[PDB]
Amino acid sequence: AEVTQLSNGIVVATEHNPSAHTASVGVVFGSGAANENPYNNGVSNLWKNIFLSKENSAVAAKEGLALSSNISRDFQSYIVSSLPGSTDKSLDFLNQSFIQQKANLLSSSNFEATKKSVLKQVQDFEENDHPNRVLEHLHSTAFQNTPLSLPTRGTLESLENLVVADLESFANNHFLNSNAVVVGTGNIKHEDLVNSIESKNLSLQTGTKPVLKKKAAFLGSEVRLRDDTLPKAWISLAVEGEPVNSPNYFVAKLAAQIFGSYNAFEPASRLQGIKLLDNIQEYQLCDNFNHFSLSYKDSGLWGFSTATRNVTMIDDLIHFTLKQWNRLTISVTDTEVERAKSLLKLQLGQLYESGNPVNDANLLGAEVLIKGSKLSLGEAFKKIDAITVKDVKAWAGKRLWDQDIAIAGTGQIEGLLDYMRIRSDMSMMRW
Amino acid sequence: GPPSGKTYMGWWGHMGGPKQKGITSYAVSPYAQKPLQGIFHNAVFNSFRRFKSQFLYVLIPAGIYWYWWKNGNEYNEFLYSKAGREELERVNV
């Protein structure tokens, strides 16, 4: 299905899908925002946004190419998608303006306009988008003083000290042949992509990226960005979870799928088979929740996020969901595991098997970059079907039962109790 | 029951302080900390700082009242001695 080969310096990965009507090539590097200082934080955002400038994207639009890019913790990608007959126009564009001739992109009077719009973008992020900024603050307090603690968008105080020297320094240090996968999704075939990446003699750079002196360590902590002038209360709360290439990767995904997501205002979201709903529905404790299992290279996160307007009963919402977490160690049933198996297979099928080949390019690039190949969906389903109740109980006794947590909150979180009551909720006194 | 009068302390969520903006608080798990950190430094330097700040207020009235009590005790011991009877009669009546 996926095929992956290694050229003179570049690894190439394709997912050919002959019933698609767009093809999409690009390059996925292996250094997201986890490879920055607290002082050049926001360099990858500036590279994402100078790759998508108006004068860089006008050249792609005249040839019928649509640009896309993504900054994450581990990886970063730069994707050019077009019609199936014009894959080499895309490879030519990605070469001649991003890979080799990046001196017109890094023009001053282009850098200034892009830096100004990125500053405006993160300023409107930091004061209007409340669930995502507390997920970023959960990351920045769970992994503090380690490289995984950095926001992917950067920081308004960090971003206004950046110059073009920092962008080209990061480019020299990280945009390398040893760090990059060239991806192709859509109905581009593999032999045509390798034949046109050896037809042009495409070479990115020849160094090797710096290796970080400390690994990401989970520190049980809290942060409270309280603001009484906001309507709701947004609370994210997580334990240390599994990183990628765990053996407990799918067990963590399944254990997050057991408690699922919920929306108070959708009538078929109130009828789910979660036993948390018939504790939080009687007094309408929350508006929504979602249980996540975020996996990175070094470490991971496992927890939930809620937004609620019932600011008087936040502590009972937290108490009821953590007493529902305890059942994974003690008394999780057969049925909850089977239901979460079916829902997890559906969620992974909707994530991978989707029509958009930009998303397939991002997923294939990050997966092949971190473990050298890509696990198929049939093998993923055969690894999900093999999970038992004892695997969930063993994983929850390891990672959940009586462990330190990380909390982040904004809004009206006066009703949220301190660290120690919430942490003492993580293990019940066997009743 | 009925609601009672207006108080100066609500509950969790509606305490009754002012609105708070721009204050961020950070804290670490005690399971990741060292309790008894700095006890041998605070036991000698912080103790001396607190004593130096708050000892004239306690020990000047203590000195006044203890000197008054000792002086009255010495006078009562003198008055009921053989050497001080001849003041004791002209003192009491």
Swiss-Prot record, chain A:
InterPro entries: Metalloenz_LuxS/M16 (IPR011249), MPP/UQCRC_Complex (IPR050361), Pept_M16_N (IPR011765), Peptidase_M16_C (IPR007863). GO terms for biological process: aerobic respiration; cellular respiration; mitochondrial electron transport, ubiquinol to cytochrome c; protein processing involved in protein targeting to mitochondrion; proton transmembrane transport. GO terms for cellular component: mitochondrial inner membrane; mitochondrion; respiratory chain complex III. Its main location: mitochondrion. It is a peripheral membrane protein. It is found in: Mitochondrion inner membrane. Component of the ubiquinol-cytochrome c oxidoreductase (cytochrome b-c1 complex, complex III, CIII), a multisubunit enzyme composed of 10 subunits. The complex is composed of 3 respiratory subunits cytochrome b (COB), cytochrome c1 (CYT1) and Rieske protein (RIP1), 2 core protein subunits COR1 and QCR2, and 5 low-molecular weight protein subunits QCR6, QCR7, QCR8, QCR9 and QCR10. Component of the ubiquinol-cytochrome c oxidoreductase, a multisubunit transmembrane complex that is part of the mitochondrial electron transport chain which drives oxidative phosphorylation. PANTHER family: CYTOCHROME B-C1 COMPLEX SUBUNIT 1, MITOCHONDRIAL, METALLOPROTEASE. This is Cytochrome b-c1 complex subunit 1, mitochondrial. It comes from Saccharomyces cerevisiae (strain ATCC 204508 / S288c). The lineage of its organism: Eukaryota, Fungi, Dikarya, Ascomycota, Saccharomycotina. The gene is COR1.
Swiss-Prot record, chain B:
Residues 1-48 are mitochondrial matrix. Gene3D superfamilies: Cytochrome b-c1 complex subunit 8. One of its GO terms (cellular component) is mitochondrial inner membrane. GO terms for molecular function: ubiquinol-cytochrome-c reductase activity. This is Cytochrome b-c1 complex subunit 8, mitochondrial. The chain crosses the membrane at residues 49-79. The keyword Translocase does not apply. The gene is QCR8. It is found in: Mitochondrion inner membrane. It comes from Saccharomyces cerevisiae (strain ATCC 204508 / S288c). Its main location: mitochondrion. Present with 6140 molecules/cell in log phase SD medium. PANTHER family: CYTOCHROME B-C1 COMPLEX SUBUNIT 8, UBIQUINOL-CYTOCHROME C REDUCTASE COMPLEX UBIQUINONE-BINDING PROTEIN QP-C. Component of the ubiquinol-cytochrome c oxidoreductase, a multisubunit transmembrane complex that is part of the mitochondrial electron transport chain which drives oxidative phosphorylation. It comes from the Eukaryota. Keywords: Electron transport, Membrane, Mitochondrion, Mitochondrion inner membrane, Respiratory chain, Transmembrane, Transmembrane helix, Transport. It is a single-pass membrane protein. Component of the ubiquinol-cytochrome c oxidoreductase (cytochrome b-c1 complex, complex III, CIII), a multisubunit enzyme composed of 10 subunits. The complex is composed of 3 respiratory subunits cytochrome b (COB), cytochrome c1 (CYT1) and Rieske protein (RIP1), 2 core protein subunits COR1 and QCR2, and 5 low-molecular weight protein subunits QCR6, QCR7, QCR8, QCR9 and QCR10. Residues 80-93 are mitochondrial intermembrane. GO terms for biological process: aerobic respiration; cellular respiration; mitochondrial electron transport, ubiquinol to cytochrome c. Belongs to the UQCRQ/QCR8 family. SUPFAM superfamilies: Ubiquinone-binding protein QP-C of cytochrome bc1 complex (Ubiquinol-cytochrome c reductase). It holds the Pfam family UcrQ.
